[PDB]
């Protein structure tokens, strides 16, 4: 057995993903009957399917080898922004009135069944020491329960120094808003696993230049995090950690401004 | 006066007050003798000048020839007609035409990207319903403005346009006039069959040709004169006709202004006159 | 008894792949066991059938595909194709080429149309493209050459930016048999003049230059026993693949 | 009180002049007569010349984006490509480059091999930057859906080498006194820190030492930091 255990990502009800493991009687000792092939025999690459019947955790046993899954999903839909046929997302503040500053809002809708996590990070195009002081965006980070609606409001007080670069064109790219979102439990799983790997020192050299910067703002305890104990019996490992980071959803709304 | 100009006349486009356009023409002596001629611009409204004042003089030595440049600055909105006279220092005459004012049709309630495109979204297809949107057209100029709108669907079935309803298809806008263009789309099952794959689907493209109305009258007279002679019929005009043909039609509401009849345009100035036809292509999408 | 569809035709389907079409005690009569009704080509070629109510409704189909790949042109992650002429050398004109290869099993048809970004009456076209129209036998590869002679009217608008859009190359391609089918029915479309009012400007412009007799067109007689009609034409004209290539040119310095 | 005990310009092109206002209001003009530094009650600093860092052998868009394609993933092989970098300027150039892949997995940087990661170019020096991608199994799991896949983004921060020495001089003080020692700088440092390290081949020029720049004008000096992004494309 190459993989000591198999862990699936959070999957919506009525969808099944397969995963393989390389290796006598065989049987899935599952009480909730989430994992199937149900009981086989083979003489000497095996593949197991996962179909979440109930929203919630799923733990299975093969005659031993451990199987891990968790059912439900999260779909953060961004609204009141413009989306292109190509795919890119666009938010316009309007024209620059003298002696005034600009401000806008975004709507976030959770169309899933599980809790969702959202970390927002704003990056302006111009650079100067107080480049963070000109933008004020709130909430910077939050959680959304299923079918919850939240408005994120962002105010921009343009200084002369950024507009000195925004001068040239009539519609000026001023910044990019990155929204990292997804399901809350996968964040708990990756947080637990990252604490495990950092405590043992697996990733603390060079390969950690970019990776920490991608996983840092999500492994912290969020504000409003009501600790759910459904994810404590699921132990994920190093080999499947990439498949866990694959469910980190990221979108980059564009910020524009006319003349 | 042995002389042979290149341009029989010089005609300018439409220029804002306080803006000047230059145009040059090559004047050539034909006789192998020594001629010396005076060029005087008889301008009544101070619209045309030289490149100095209102009168110059030059000598030409046996086909030794030159290139003169004339500037145009329309002080008043309205037509401008002058004539340069070449006398000896018997007459030679070249006449000049220009017309002042401008038009700036501004499209509004549409989205503009940093790239340059303009984007209009209908929304999300609700079951048993159809979609609709609107755009604002504002004339911020000094002259009357002309707008021809033409819609091209993305799907290709024989009755593709009958699912689209666009109003107004063609119109004029006076300065500081506001007009709203309404677009209704009741999709047939054949339209959505391709839009399936993505979440935001391109459904059509709306072309808006706009500009100043009088230049349309000038281009219309020139296009009608040229089309009957067969000058503009063949291969090199496939794209040009398709942009300039639907605009030479008689518009609805066209109040015939007689200010452009004293302006004589020619074959030689047809390209730079048609280059000032402003054209934009709004995108039409939805989010299924 | 009465059927909203007196006949049922499909499009040209890939080998071994099935296409379903719905229509609204039960026996069928097909010769090559090809066939709500489902279609699967068991012989690479045309397909026919006459079902028997228990009283006849005619079914038609055609099997095969034509995958014409455009190469030596840059493709985008978003999906837009991009061709560059390079840089405007003084006293010279710019040139480029694209390759088109039919990686399918049926004949492919390719009509090319160019639209410049500059509009002006010169009567000597700065663009020279060859071949404007052609057809490809299976696995036939052809090169399309494009030459641009920049006159001052072209460069007068291309001045502002460093990378200038100079033209748009539309390639309408697909399988020859569906072109014969659409042309055959399109001739009858004109016998009644059914949609000449406003459709005449967006539909005819897309489907008329395809109904002309191509050069090299060797008349295949496999599409004559086919009886597709007006109602399925909307579906039949769906297999006209149309791609757009950008034409770009970098300005000096 | 004249709001600035010192006033610095940027590196200006040959023979073109830029005016700057300095309140007291007053306006002053600079024009470079010699490629090199420049120094009543007067206290002013400036320096003339330019470095045009041109990226070539990469496809550009009418919109302005840049695109590099590795070709198609042949089985059992790994992919590699190269870009040309030419200094069509008059002063030395600095070209700190960093690549960030589009796939998130713990060994991101190791699968990518890019050289040179750091270098500087004197005027009209031409260098080729090679970048090789060994597709690890985590990478292709995301690139499956479409036919043309975005695999990474390569940031090239380039500009004038001499202005970099001034930026380092000001940033070292600004951090030794802790003016900008906080964490909000996490978006600024990522933009300006990888250029303040000592490059290889850096021959210390002493022409930038008499240029006494201060805290307030740092923004204007760091305004001339050119930033381009190259898209990384893989077919199939």
């Amino acid at each position: 057995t190459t993989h000591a255990a198999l862990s699936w990502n959070s999957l919506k009800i009525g969808k099944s993903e397969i995963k393989e493991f390389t290796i006598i009687q065989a049987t899935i000792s599952d009480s909730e009957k989430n994992f199937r092939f149900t009981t086989i025999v083979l003489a000497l690459t095996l593949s197991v399917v996962f179909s979440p019947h109930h929203i919630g955790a799923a733990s299975g046993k093969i005659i031993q080898i451990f199987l891990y899954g968790y059912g439900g999903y999260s779909k953060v839909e961004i609204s009141e922004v413009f989306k292109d046929t190509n795919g890119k997302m666009w938010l316009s503040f309007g024209m620059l009135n003298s002696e005034n500053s600009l401000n806008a809002k975004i709507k976030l809708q959770n169309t899933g069944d599980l809790c969702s996590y959202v970390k927002i990070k704003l990056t302006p195009k111009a650079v100067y020491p107080t480049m963070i002081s000109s933008w004020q965006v709130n909430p910077t980070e939050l959680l959304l329960n299923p079918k919850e609606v939240q408005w994120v409001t962002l105010e921009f007080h343009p200084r002369k120094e950024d507009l000195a670069l925004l001068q040239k064109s009539d519609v000026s790219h001023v910044g990019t808003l990155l929204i990292t979102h997804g399901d809350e439990p996968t964040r708990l799983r990756i947080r637990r696993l990252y604490k495990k790997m950092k405590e043992t020192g697996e990733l603390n050299g060079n390969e950690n230049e970019t990776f920490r910067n991608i996983v840092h703002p999500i492994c912290k305890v969020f504000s409003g995090e009501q600790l759910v104990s459904d994810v404590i019996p699921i132990r994920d490992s190093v080999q499947n950690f990439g498949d866990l980071c694959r469910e980190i959803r990221q979108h980059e709304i564009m910020l524009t401004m006319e003349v």
Side-chain angles (χ1 to χ4, degrees), chain A:
Chain A
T1 62
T2 300
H3 295 286
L6 279 73
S7 68
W8 279 263
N9 291 318
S10 66
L11 294 175
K12 186 176 180 180
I13 54 170
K15 291 175 71 175
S16 180
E17 183 63 27
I18 66 169
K19 289 177 72 174
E20 66 182 2
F21 63 105
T22 301
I23 189 167
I24 191 65
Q25 299 174 357
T27 183
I28 292 171
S29 178
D30 192 359
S31 294
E32 300 171 353
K33 295 180 184 292
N34 292 117
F35 299 97
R36 295 176 181 176
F37 290 105
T38 185
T39 298
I40 61 170
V41 66
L42 56 88
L44 290 173
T45 180
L46 189 59
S47 65
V48 174
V49 302
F50 175 71
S51 178
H53 304 285
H54 300 89
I55 302 301
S59 66
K61 298 176 184 178
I62 291 173
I63 191 167
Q64 57 312 57
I65 300 301
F66 297 100
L67 282 73
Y68 290 154
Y70 182 60
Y73 78 100
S74 67
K75 184 178 180 180
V76 174
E77 294 179 354
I78 298 93
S79 296
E80 296 294 328
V81 300
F82 187 79
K83 293 183 286 293
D84 293 333
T85 65
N86 290 319
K88 299 295 182 183
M89 292 170 69
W90 294 92
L91 194 154
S92 178
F93 293 166
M95 183 180 75
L96 178 63
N97 288 318
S98 66
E99 292 180 353
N100 288 318
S101 296
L102 284 74
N103 54 5
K105 291 182 181 180
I106 300 169
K107 184 170 73 176
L108 280 73
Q109 180 76 45
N110 192 358
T111 313
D113 54 4
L114 268 63
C115 183
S116 179
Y117 76 99
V118 174
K119 180 70 173 66
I120 296 170
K121 295 180 287 293
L122 179 58
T123 60
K125 188 173 176 66
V127 294
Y128 53 96
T130 60
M131 64 183 282
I132 302 94
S133 178
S134 297
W135 294 94
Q136 185 177 2
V137 60
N138 51 2
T140 184
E141 65 177 359
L142 73 162
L143 300 176
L144 281 76
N145 294 115
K147 295 296 290 182
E148 185 177 1
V149 183
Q150 185 65 41
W151 287 90
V152 175
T153 181
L154 57 89
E155 301 90 5
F156 173 64
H157 305 283
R159 190 174 295 170
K160 56 94 175 179
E161 187 174 1
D162 69 6
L163 296 172
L165 292 172
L166 297 174
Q167 179 182 1
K168 184 67 177 68
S169 295
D170 291 331
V171 176
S172 297
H173 182 194
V174 66
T176 58
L177 187 64
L178 181 63
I179 295 91
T180 65
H181 64 89
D183 54 351
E184 173 63 26
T186 302
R187 185 181 68 84
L188 298 174
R189 295 172 66 187
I190 63 173
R191 186 177 71 188
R192 184 180 180 181
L193 197 155
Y194 188 77
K195 289 178 69 68
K196 186 186 266 78
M197 288 182 73
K198 183 177 284 293
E199 181 181 1
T200 184
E202 298 291 328
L203 66 163
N204 196 0
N206 192 0
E207 72 275 15
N208 197 4
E209 170 66 26
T210 302
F211 190 78
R212 178 58 171 166
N213 291 120
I214 297 172
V215 75
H216 172 76
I218 58 174
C219 291
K220 62 181 177 180
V221 177
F222 282 168
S223 65
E225 179 178 358
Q226 297 299 109
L227 183 63
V228 61
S229 178
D230 198 3
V231 299
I232 63 168
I234 185 168
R235 270 84 68 189
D236 297 331
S237 179
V238 176
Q239 69 274 15
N240 61 9
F241 186 66
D243 295 332
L244 292 174
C245 292
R246 181 167 60 244
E247 293 292 329
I248 307 299
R249 290 179 178 89
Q250 291 183 355
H251 293 89
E252 56 186 2
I253 296 170
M254 293 292 290
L255 294 176
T256 62
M257 182 177 282
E258 292 181 354
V259 69

Short mmCIF file of all heavy atoms in Angstrom, two decimals, chain A residues 152-180:
data_model
loop_
_atom_site.label_atom_id
_atom_site.label_comp_id
_atom_site.label_asym_id
_atom_site.label_seq_id
_atom_site.Cartn_x
_atom_site.Cartn_y
_atom_site.Cartn_z
N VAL A 152 -19.47 43.72 1.21
CA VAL A 152 -18.13 44.22 1.51
C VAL A 152 -18.01 45.61 0.90
O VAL A 152 -18.15 45.77 -0.31
CB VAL A 152 -17.04 43.28 0.97
CG1 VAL A 152 -15.66 43.88 1.20
CG2 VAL A 152 -17.15 41.91 1.61
N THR A 153 -17.74 46.61 1.73
CA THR A 153 -17.63 47.98 1.27
C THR A 153 -16.17 48.42 1.29
O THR A 153 -15.44 48.16 2.26
CB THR A 153 -18.51 48.92 2.10
OG1 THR A 153 -18.39 50.26 1.61
CG2 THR A 153 -18.15 48.87 3.58
N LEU A 154 -15.75 49.07 0.21
CA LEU A 154 -14.37 49.51 0.04
C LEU A 154 -14.37 50.98 -0.35
O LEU A 154 -15.01 51.37 -1.34
CB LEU A 154 -13.63 48.64 -0.98
CG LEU A 154 -14.14 48.44 -2.41
CD1 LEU A 154 -13.59 49.50 -3.33
CD2 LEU A 154 -13.78 47.05 -2.92
N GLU A 155 -13.67 51.81 0.43
CA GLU A 155 -13.53 53.23 0.17
C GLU A 155 -12.10 53.51 -0.28
O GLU A 155 -11.14 52.94 0.24
CB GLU A 155 -13.83 54.07 1.41
CG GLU A 155 -15.23 53.89 2.00
CD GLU A 155 -15.28 52.79 3.03
OE1 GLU A 155 -14.22 52.22 3.36
OE2 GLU A 155 -16.39 52.49 3.53
N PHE A 156 -11.98 54.39 -1.27
CA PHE A 156 -10.71 54.76 -1.86
C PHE A 156 -10.62 56.28 -1.86
O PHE A 156 -11.43 56.96 -2.50
CB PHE A 156 -10.57 54.20 -3.28
CG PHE A 156 -9.35 54.67 -4.01
CD1 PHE A 156 -8.08 54.34 -3.56
CD2 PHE A 156 -9.48 55.40 -5.18
CE1 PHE A 156 -6.96 54.77 -4.25
CE2 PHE A 156 -8.36 55.82 -5.87
CZ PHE A 156 -7.10 55.51 -5.40
N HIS A 157 -9.65 56.80 -1.12
CA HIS A 157 -9.35 58.22 -1.06
C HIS A 157 -8.12 58.47 -1.93
O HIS A 157 -6.99 58.32 -1.45
CB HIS A 157 -9.09 58.65 0.39
CG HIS A 157 -10.21 58.31 1.32
ND1 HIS A 157 -11.38 59.04 1.38
CD2 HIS A 157 -10.34 57.32 2.24
CE1 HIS A 157 -12.18 58.51 2.29
NE2 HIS A 157 -11.57 57.47 2.83
N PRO A 158 -8.30 58.83 -3.20
CA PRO A 158 -7.14 58.94 -4.10
C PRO A 158 -6.22 60.08 -3.68
O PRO A 158 -6.67 61.21 -3.45
CB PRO A 158 -7.78 59.20 -5.46
CG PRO A 158 -9.09 59.83 -5.15
CD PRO A 158 -9.56 59.20 -3.87
N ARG A 159 -4.94 59.78 -3.59
CA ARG A 159 -3.93 60.80 -3.37
C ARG A 159 -3.36 61.25 -4.71
O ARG A 159 -3.52 60.57 -5.73
CB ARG A 159 -2.83 60.26 -2.45
CG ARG A 159 -1.84 61.29 -1.93
CD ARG A 159 -0.90 60.64 -0.92
NE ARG A 159 -1.62 60.22 0.28
CZ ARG A 159 -1.09 59.47 1.24
NH1 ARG A 159 0.16 59.06 1.15
NH2 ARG A 159 -1.83 59.13 2.29
N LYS A 160 -2.72 62.41 -4.72
CA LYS A 160 -2.15 62.93 -5.95
C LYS A 160 -1.07 62.02 -6.53
O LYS A 160 -0.87 61.97 -7.75
CB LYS A 160 -1.61 64.35 -5.72
CG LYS A 160 -0.59 64.47 -4.59
CD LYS A 160 0.84 64.36 -5.09
CE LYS A 160 1.83 64.59 -3.95
NZ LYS A 160 3.24 64.47 -4.40
N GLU A 161 -0.37 61.26 -5.67
CA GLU A 161 0.77 60.48 -6.14
C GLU A 161 0.36 59.26 -6.97
O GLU A 161 1.08 58.90 -7.91
CB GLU A 161 1.62 60.06 -4.94
CG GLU A 161 2.92 59.38 -5.29
CD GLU A 161 3.78 59.11 -4.07
OE1 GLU A 161 3.33 59.44 -2.95
OE2 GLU A 161 4.89 58.57 -4.23
N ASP A 162 -0.76 58.61 -6.66
CA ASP A 162 -1.21 57.51 -7.51
C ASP A 162 -1.80 58.04 -8.82
O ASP A 162 -1.60 57.45 -9.89
CB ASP A 162 -2.18 56.58 -6.75
CG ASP A 162 -3.52 57.22 -6.45
OD1 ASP A 162 -3.79 58.34 -6.89
OD2 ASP A 162 -4.31 56.58 -5.73
N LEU A 163 -2.54 59.15 -8.74
CA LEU A 163 -3.12 59.72 -9.94
C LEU A 163 -2.04 60.25 -10.87
O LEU A 163 -2.27 60.37 -12.08
CB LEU A 163 -4.09 60.84 -9.58
CG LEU A 163 -5.33 60.46 -8.77
CD1 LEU A 163 -6.08 61.70 -8.34
CD2 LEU A 163 -6.23 59.53 -9.56
N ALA A 164 -0.86 60.58 -10.33
CA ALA A 164 0.25 61.01 -11.17
C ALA A 164 0.62 59.94 -12.18
O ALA A 164 1.10 60.25 -13.28
CB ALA A 164 1.45 61.39 -10.31
N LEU A 165 0.41 58.67 -11.83
CA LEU A 165 0.62 57.56 -12.76
C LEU A 165 -0.65 57.20 -13.51
O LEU A 165 -0.58 56.80 -14.67
CB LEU A 165 1.13 56.32 -12.00
CG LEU A 165 2.54 56.38 -11.41
CD1 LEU A 165 2.80 55.15 -10.55
CD2 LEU A 165 3.57 56.48 -12.52
N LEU A 166 -1.81 57.35 -12.86
CA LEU A 166 -3.09 57.06 -13.51
C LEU A 166 -3.43 58.07 -14.59
O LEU A 166 -4.41 57.87 -15.32
CB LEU A 166 -4.21 57.01 -12.47
CG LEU A 166 -4.09 55.91 -11.41
CD1 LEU A 166 -5.18 56.07 -10.36
CD2 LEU A 166 -4.15 54.54 -12.05
N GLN A 167 -2.66 59.16 -14.69
CA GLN A 167 -2.91 60.24 -15.64
C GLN A 167 -3.20 59.76 -17.06
O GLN A 167 -4.20 60.14 -17.67
CB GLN A 167 -1.70 61.18 -15.66
CG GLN A 167 -1.81 62.35 -16.62
CD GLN A 167 -0.56 63.20 -16.62
OE1 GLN A 167 0.41 62.91 -15.91
NE2 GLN A 167 -0.56 64.25 -17.43
N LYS A 168 -2.33 58.90 -17.61
CA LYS A 168 -2.15 58.83 -19.06
C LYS A 168 -3.43 58.47 -19.81
O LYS A 168 -3.75 59.08 -20.83
CB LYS A 168 -1.04 57.84 -19.41
CG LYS A 168 -0.74 57.79 -20.90
CD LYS A 168 -0.12 59.10 -21.37
CE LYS A 168 0.27 59.06 -22.83
NZ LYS A 168 -0.93 58.98 -23.71
N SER A 169 -4.19 57.49 -19.31
CA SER A 169 -5.35 57.00 -20.05
C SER A 169 -6.64 57.62 -19.51
O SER A 169 -6.65 58.36 -18.53
CB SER A 169 -5.40 55.47 -19.99
OG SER A 169 -4.29 54.90 -20.66
N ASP A 170 -7.75 57.29 -20.18
CA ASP A 170 -9.06 57.77 -19.77
C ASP A 170 -9.74 56.83 -18.79
O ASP A 170 -10.47 57.28 -17.91
CB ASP A 170 -9.96 57.97 -20.99
CG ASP A 170 -9.52 59.14 -21.86
OD1 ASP A 170 -8.93 60.10 -21.31
OD2 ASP A 170 -9.76 59.10 -23.08
N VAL A 171 -9.51 55.53 -18.93
CA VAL A 171 -9.98 54.51 -18.00
C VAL A 171 -8.75 53.85 -17.41
O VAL A 171 -8.00 53.18 -18.13
CB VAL A 171 -10.90 53.48 -18.67
CG1 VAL A 171 -11.29 52.40 -17.67
CG2 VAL A 171 -12.13 54.16 -19.24
N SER A 172 -8.54 54.04 -16.11
CA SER A 172 -7.26 53.71 -15.49
C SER A 172 -7.41 52.53 -14.53
O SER A 172 -8.28 52.54 -13.65
CB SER A 172 -6.72 54.93 -14.73
OG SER A 172 -6.44 56.00 -15.62
N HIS A 173 -6.56 51.53 -14.73
CA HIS A 173 -6.43 50.43 -13.78
C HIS A 173 -5.74 50.94 -12.51
O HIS A 173 -4.58 51.36 -12.56
CB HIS A 173 -5.63 49.29 -14.40
CG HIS A 173 -5.49 48.10 -13.52
ND1 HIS A 173 -4.58 47.09 -13.77
CD2 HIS A 173 -6.15 47.74 -12.39
CE1 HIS A 173 -4.68 46.17 -12.82
NE2 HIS A 173 -5.62 46.54 -11.97
N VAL A 174 -6.45 50.88 -11.39
CA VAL A 174 -5.94 51.43 -10.14
C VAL A 174 -5.55 50.35 -9.14
O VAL A 174 -4.67 50.59 -8.31
CB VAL A 174 -6.96 52.41 -9.53
CG1 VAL A 174 -8.23 51.68 -9.10
CG2 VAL A 174 -6.35 53.18 -8.36
N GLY A 175 -6.16 49.17 -9.20
CA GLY A 175 -5.83 48.13 -8.24
C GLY A 175 -6.51 46.83 -8.59
O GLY A 175 -7.30 46.74 -9.53
N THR A 176 -6.19 45.81 -7.80
CA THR A 176 -6.74 44.47 -7.95
C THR A 176 -7.14 43.95 -6.58
O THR A 176 -6.36 44.06 -5.62
CB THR A 176 -5.75 43.51 -8.62
OG1 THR A 176 -4.56 43.43 -7.84
CG2 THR A 176 -5.42 43.96 -10.03
N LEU A 177 -8.34 43.38 -6.49
CA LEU A 177 -8.87 42.89 -5.23
C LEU A 177 -8.91 41.37 -5.29
O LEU A 177 -9.69 40.80 -6.06
CB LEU A 177 -10.25 43.47 -4.96
CG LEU A 177 -10.86 43.17 -3.59
CD1 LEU A 177 -10.00 43.82 -2.52
CD2 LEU A 177 -12.29 43.67 -3.52
N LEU A 178 -8.08 40.71 -4.48
CA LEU A 178 -8.04 39.26 -4.42
C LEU A 178 -8.94 38.77 -3.30
O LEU A 178 -8.81 39.19 -2.15
CB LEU A 178 -6.61 38.78 -4.19
CG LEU A 178 -6.41 37.26 -4.11
CD1 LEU A 178 -6.78 36.60 -5.43
CD2 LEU A 178 -4.98 36.92 -3.71
N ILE A 179 -9.86 37.88 -3.65
CA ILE A 179 -10.78 37.26 -2.71
C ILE A 179 -10.45 35.78 -2.71
O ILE A 179 -10.62 35.09 -3.73
CB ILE A 179 -12.25 37.49 -3.09
CG1 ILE A 179 -12.60 38.98 -3.01
CG2 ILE A 179 -13.17 36.67 -2.20
CD1 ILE A 179 -12.40 39.74 -4.30
N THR A 180 -9.93 35.29 -1.58
CA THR A 180 -9.70 33.88 -1.36
C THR A 180 -10.89 33.36 -0.57
O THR A 180 -11.20 33.89 0.50
CB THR A 180 -8.40 33.63 -0.60
OG1 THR A 180 -8.50 34.18 0.72
CG2 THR A 180 -7.23 34.29 -1.31
#
